[PDB]
Amino acid sequence: MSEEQVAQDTEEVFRSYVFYRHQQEQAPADPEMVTLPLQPSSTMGQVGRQLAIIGDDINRRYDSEFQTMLQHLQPTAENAYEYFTKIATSLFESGINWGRVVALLGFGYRLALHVYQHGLFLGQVTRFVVDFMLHHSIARWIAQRGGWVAALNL
């Protein structure tokens, strides 16, 4: 499986992940997490749904910590790319595992939610996630392990 294929899968996984996380957590949420195009029957759509379900407990455990941190980081449309890239790079500095790959999806979700709540961005954050994983060689790491479906089979 190619890195470009993983990148295309990543967009679908993240799109579906944010839909199901939004629904799981029902604060103003971003309507585009509902209304942007979505194929719930697709293969990667189902992977993203499963990742959201799996992560519900851990996400609730750390919700207050992340939101206090994001509240003080104050990400905006102007600096979100810089902050996302620095966070994502440092996250993988000591190594890649599926937990950390999935945690980056969760950070993307929280980042998109925060910028919506405080400004007037989901499409952009989607590109940040896909492009980072592609160019930083996370996509290769995923391809070596059989693709995104491997995340459901630890």
Partner: peptide, 23 residues
Amino acid sequence: DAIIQMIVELLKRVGDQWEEEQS
């Protein structure tokens, strides 16, 4: 940069806890 590294530390902790529980 301080809060960047604070977020990174939490994501690493969240991710490693996720990995172990799913494994």
